[PDB]
A paper describes a structure:
However, amongst these remodelers, the [name] chromatin remodeler appears largely sufficient to generate the well positioned +1 and −1 nucleosomes. S.c [name] is a multi-subunit complex consisting of 15 subunits that are divided into three different modules. The catalytic module with the [name] (ATPase) RecA lobes and insert, Arp5, Ies6, Ies2, Rvb1 and Rvb2, constitutes the core unit of [name] (C-module). [name] slides nucleosomes with 40 bp of flanking DNA ~100-fold slower than nucleosomes with 80 bp of flanking DNA, displaying a switch like response to flanking DNA length.
To test whether the reorientation of the Arp8 module was dependent on the species of histones used, we performed biochemical and structural studies of [name] on nucleosomes containing S.c histones assembled on the 601-nucleosome positioning sequence (S.c nucleosomes) with either 80 or 40 bp of flanking DNA. We found that the remodeling rates of nucleosomes containing all S.c histones were within 2-fold of remodeling rates containing S.c H2A, H2B, H3 and X.l H4. Therefore, for all experiments except those in Fig. S6, we used X.l H4 instead of S.c H4 to make S.c nucleosomes as generating large amounts of X.l H4 is technically feasible. Shortening the flanking DNA from 80 to 40 bp for S.c nucleosomes reduced the remodeling rate of [name] by ~100-fold. Two distinct classes were identified in this dataset for 0/40 S.c nucleosomes, with the grappler region of Arp5 adopting either a crossed or parallel conformation. These conformations have also been observed for [name] bound to 0/80 nucleosomes, but the functional consequence of these conformations has not been identified. In comparison, for the [name]: S.c 0/80 (ADP/BeFx) and [name]: X.l 0/80 (ADP/BeFx) datasets, a much smaller proportion of particles fell in classes 1a and 1b. It is further informative that, for the [name]: S.c 0/40 (ADP/BeFx) and [name]: X.l 0/40 (ADP/BeFx) complexes, only a small proportion of particles have either clear or partial density for the Arp8 module on the flanking DNA. Our structures with 0/40 nucleosomes suggest that the Arp8 module sequesters the HSA away from flanking DNA thereby inhibiting its ability to bind flanking DNA.
Residue numbers in the entry:
A (entry chain A), B (entry chain E): 38 to 134
C (entry chain H): 36 to 128
D (entry chain S): 112 to 162
E (entry chain R): 439 to 452, 463 to 506, 547 to 571, 584 to 588
F (entry chain B), G (entry chain F): 25 to 103
H (entry chain G): 13 to 120
Write the structure that this text describes.
Amino acid sequence: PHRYKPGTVALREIRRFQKSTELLIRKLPFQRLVREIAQDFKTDLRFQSSAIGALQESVEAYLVSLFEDTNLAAIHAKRVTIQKKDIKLARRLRGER
Amino acid sequence: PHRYKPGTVALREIRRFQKSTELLIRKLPFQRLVREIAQDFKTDLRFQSSAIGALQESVEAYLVSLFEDTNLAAIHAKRVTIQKKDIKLARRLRGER
Amino acid sequence: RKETYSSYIYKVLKQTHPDTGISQKSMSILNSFVNDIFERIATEASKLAAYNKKSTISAREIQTAVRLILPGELAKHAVSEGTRAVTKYSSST
Amino acid sequence: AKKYCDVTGLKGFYKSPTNNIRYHNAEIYQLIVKPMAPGVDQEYLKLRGAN
Amino acid sequence: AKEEEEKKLKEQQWDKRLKLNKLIKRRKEKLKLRDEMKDRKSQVSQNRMKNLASLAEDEAFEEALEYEYKDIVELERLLLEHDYDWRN
Amino acid sequence: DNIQGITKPAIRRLARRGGVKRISGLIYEETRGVLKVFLENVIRDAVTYTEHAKRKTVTAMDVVYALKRQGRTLYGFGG
Amino acid sequence: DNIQGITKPAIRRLARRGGVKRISGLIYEETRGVLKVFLENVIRDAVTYTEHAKRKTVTAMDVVYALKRQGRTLYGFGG
Amino acid sequence: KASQSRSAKAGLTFPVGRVHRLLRRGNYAQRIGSGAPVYLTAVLEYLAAEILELAGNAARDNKKTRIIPRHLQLAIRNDDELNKLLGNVTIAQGGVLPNIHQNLLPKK
DNA sequence: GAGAATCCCGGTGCCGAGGCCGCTCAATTGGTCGTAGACAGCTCTAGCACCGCTTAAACGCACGTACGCGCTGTCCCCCGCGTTTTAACCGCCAAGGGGATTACTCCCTAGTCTCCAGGCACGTGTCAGATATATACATCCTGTGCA
DNA sequence: TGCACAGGATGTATATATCTGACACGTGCCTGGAGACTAGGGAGTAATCCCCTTGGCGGTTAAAACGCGGGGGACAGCGCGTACGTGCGTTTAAGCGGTGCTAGAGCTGTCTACGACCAATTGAGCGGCCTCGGCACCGGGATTCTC
């Protein structure tokens, strides 16, 4: 049959996800995560769905900004693949230690 | 015929200037610079003496804060020497554009 | 009772685009936006009026605040629109 | 009252709608009236007391 | 350089003047349009940015072109002769 | 399985929204730790706003003020 | 010639404050490039502060007030 | 004797007296001047008009009659001064711009 | 092994950091009144929990090819250093221009009563999408026959 | 063994009929913004004093500018292997959606005690002035990296 170059259908998937605006994290594991992390500070705590939504959009926006900064720091480092030392450099030069 | 290796006296004077805390910029050319950048907006400007020292402390602190980050960027770039892309990478990761 | 800027925002887009609908989410985005500029301008003006040892907030205080907060191009358009509106309001004679 | 140009003192035919300054012709509008800084138009209008 | 010499030889072998003056005026209008596209606050550059955004949703070169247009106008004036004042 | 409740292609989805090309395998638990350390700072402020309000439920406004605290303000749910 | 007021051994003085063994010779013109902008951004928000006070001298109080507006509240000279 | 509001006295479609009410019981100063709510009303009206103009041609560039926050997000981040104003704010359901660095393309 | 280059130990004005008293406003005490937080008590939105069907996404094992990384060889440009030279800085005198402040004025903004229409809230109608008939015409594919 | 022709089947093509489907407009209401009237104190104007800061000296001196030899560093280039992407089989547990229940948001009523406001008072923290020892500065010997 006919195949594709590794690194070409990746660009199609990148442009598909960047034209898209849909949410990329599943709702129920995220709600379990925020309830298990809110159990540490105060028990018997209920939640509202728009609060979970605001938390979710905040975290994916911060993750997208961090991933763009890591990509920029990695292509500064004469490479293509991102590694954890670029994550540490981006967090160190972003202020959050 | 005693010649030092390049960079040893650099590290030694680095140690003395880590001990030292005085101002490193000449005062009167800095006054000339702030007057010549201030005449563009309203002529016949008077200047207090303490404000120029506050400005000098501000630019020295901002130099130190940016220079530490570009040092970390150049260390991360597998080099001993800084360059222009280290500077705009530090300004990009700090968020100063 | 709850307050929104929905009708005023509505007529604002009706002068510029008559055949244009609006989303409720977009209306909430716009309401949060105008409220944020309002609280920023108000705290800048109150802080400046406290800094000049004055107990009155006037038009020149928010004039300096608009010069301070907004970038220069949108700043002089904003103060131009404000000056024509204020001089039109002050002609009650 | 007669209308005169605020920049040159000649006969003012047109008035700019932004800063309300009477000017004489097109190149006066392009060189002076259009790119003038704020705070200058009020001083130009101070001479005839129109601010 | 032989090609350049041959081109010069061909040039030596070589209402129309009013049409050339109209072309010079159109080149001046093109320089004005390039200056309007350079200023991003202008409506021409705003329309160009709107066209770029619609495609997304689907200055030294201008000075060199103006210098070349002025050279072409000077060549046309020399051909007419041979073959912005402060007072206004 | 709560900390790793975020599945393996989800960090990939957030990565290609961030415009990366090649992803390493050791980033995933580190991004999980970064996520949990951001979330720890956010919801601590959110539940302090919650127990000040004499309530045991976290509704829509004490979270948007919580992200308004550190300069990461979000629009739309301010009412 | 007055824009050359900051001098190359003073940039070396700032460079040996940061702790770097080797400084390339084209950093010195880059360091001026990041300076004439940045202090400019306090001059945009100092003298207009001064202009609101009917004031034709800048002093020690309005400059630290401008830095507090920018985000670098500094100690030592009042305010 | 009956006369209309201050907003059409200033020729504005935003509520002047409501801005004055929010200024007075917003607790910013103990005395509030007369011309301040008119100036603030004009400034916020102009900013809303400019934002809705940008959302307008952003939505005409997608061939639609309604405003989605995709259009708002685009009209914010393709303009540089609104980029500088709204740098630290995140919009609800906005996404990101289509961008790719030059060396990451299949250059060959 | 030597040599710059330090850390360390002791003598010197000095000048800027601790008392001190004079005293002038600002914190303290008391009283009165009008309202705003506290508590009780109430009506319904909405959040938690659970069952079950559908299925699209996710986990796992397999392999294949760039790409991260190890080594190398070389221009070469920063680096340490001697020599001019240039402006920075300290001591100082003199002006005058601009900030602080005192002092009376008057207007306009705070406060209160009245009162009616602005904008909310909640009802009812009107052009865009989706299955459906439908018959005839045209194109494409498959089968058969012929050379 | 291939090619051409004929026949059959499928797809297309453009108003209907229905027919929802989510949108934009015609009436209540109530309360808060606007007009009218009173008070008082906050900018505002201005003049006067005195303090600092902008120019102008001059000498001298750290300190920048400039040219010069040599040595590691960044530069491109080439090979080794494996880690990431690509894929199909195989779960699985997200999603819809539906229902059942009750905590708890939210609103209303009433109350009284905390706090605004005002007048008299006493003391304490600002300031001017006075006096001296901690630290920088200078000089000279011990001591540690570098070559």
